[PDB]
Amino acid sequence: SSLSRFRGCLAGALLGDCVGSFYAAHDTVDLTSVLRHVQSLEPTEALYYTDDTAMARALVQSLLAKEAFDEVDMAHRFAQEYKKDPDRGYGAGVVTVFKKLLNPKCRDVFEPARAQFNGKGSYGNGGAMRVAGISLAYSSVQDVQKFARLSAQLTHASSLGYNGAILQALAVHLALQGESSSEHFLKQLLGHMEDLEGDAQSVLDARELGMEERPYSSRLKKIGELLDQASVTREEVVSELGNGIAAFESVPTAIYCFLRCMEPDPEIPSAFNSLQRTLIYSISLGGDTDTIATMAGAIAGAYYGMDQVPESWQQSCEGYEETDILAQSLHRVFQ
Ligand SMILES: NC(=O)c1ccc[n+]([C@H]2O[C@H](COP(=O)([O-])OP(=O)(O)OC[C@H]3O[C@@H](n4cnc5c(N)ncnc54)[C@H](O)[C@@H]3O)[C@@H](O)[C@H]2O)c1
Ligand SMILES: [Mg+2]
Numbered sequence: 001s002s003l004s005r006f007r008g009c010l011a012g013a014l015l016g017d018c019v020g021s022f023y024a025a026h027d028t029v030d031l032t033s034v035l036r037h038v039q040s041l042e043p044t045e046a047l048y049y050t051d052d053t054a055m056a057r058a059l060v061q062s063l064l065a066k067e068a069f070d071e072v073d074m075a076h077r078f079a080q081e082y083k084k085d086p087d088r089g090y091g092a093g094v095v096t097v098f099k100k101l102l103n104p105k106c107r108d109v110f111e112p113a114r115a116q117f118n119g120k121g122s123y124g125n126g127g128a129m130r131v132a133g134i135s136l137a138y139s140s141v142q143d144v145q146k147f148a149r150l151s152a153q154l155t156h157a158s159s160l161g162y163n164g165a166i167l168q169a170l171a172v173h174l175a176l177q178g179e180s181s182s183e184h185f186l187k188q189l190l191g192h193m194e195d196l197e198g199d200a201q202s203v204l205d206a207r208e209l210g211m212e213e214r215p216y217s218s219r220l221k222k223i224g225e226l227l228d229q230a231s232v233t234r235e236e237v238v239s240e241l242g243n244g245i246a247a248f249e250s251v252p253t254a255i256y257c258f259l260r261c262m263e264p265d266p267e268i269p270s271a272f273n274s275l276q277r278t279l280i281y282s283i284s285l286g287g288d289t290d291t292i293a294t295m296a297g298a299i300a301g302a303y304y305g306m307d308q309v310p311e312s313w314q315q316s317c318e319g320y321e322e323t324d325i326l327a328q329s330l331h332r333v334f335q
């Protein structure tokens, strides 16, 4: 059901953040060691969430409070959540946005993000790490892109930053539509990114800024190559897609993890379901594990639904009940 997919999406995102952060802090990022310690996930709420979930919650609470996108409300919810708990693991640059939004003199909630990094904007993955709720609030693809972009621009004004958020939101949107081949899923995403990155003002800006042409489209094409490739190794995935804090080096990677893990992996025991396998695999890539896993888990959770959210894993996660209530509320309000 759509309710099951809404609940699965937000639970999967929470699992990716909580389980990913557990392994990141224990310096356990290779597959054998992840599998060795799955018992630590208790197969009380022992796994803390990070800034990924803190911002995801604030984004969803803003949409529910206004039953619409309100940039002032959402920006203030982000800044107030930072002020309440600044120690969740926020990016070093984005804290400047929050501090500016907390200034009473601030008159334009989008200006701080535009001023980041000498006026070029952040390219980090923070706009995408929190975006899944957009695709629960907005069922139409045009609205998904519109509000993924706007919500990301509150902190991430560069096209790499906000187009990464759009791509992640589109992947969650597509996953909510149910069963698909990997090929069809990837082709749909590629078609949307080609439209967005082929736009005249966009490819001109990529020219004057020295960037490469159609960056996300190129990486989605690389994903299709990897999905057809024999004996793909972690080193090839990381070398070709990245595992970094930049949206460009993490959003495609998360999507690859979802697509690859739609099929069994001989290196991951078959006792794990498809959502679990996706999370385990994503964490084994290392790098920015909490954000790659939160994004892969949001897509996988929307796709597989609550039936694949293991109670023992879910109940180990800080705030899993509030996360589930928010998912059900989004369904009641917007569906
Ligand atoms: N293991 C990790 O990498 C790790 C662990 C905890 C938290 N984080 C945090 O870092 C990631 C990104 O967060 P965010 O995008 O909200 O924070 P952000 O401050 O907007 O960007 C994060 C970092 O990327 C760099 N950066 C981004 N844009 C530019 C630019 N235009 N020029 C030069 N450098 C730039 C810079 O080092 C900045 O601090 C998230 O995963 C967040 O959780 C990362
Ligand atoms: Mg984090």
Ligand SMILES: [Mg+2]
Pocket (backbone or CB within 6 Å): 288, 289, 290, 291, 292
């Ligand atoms: Mg992170």
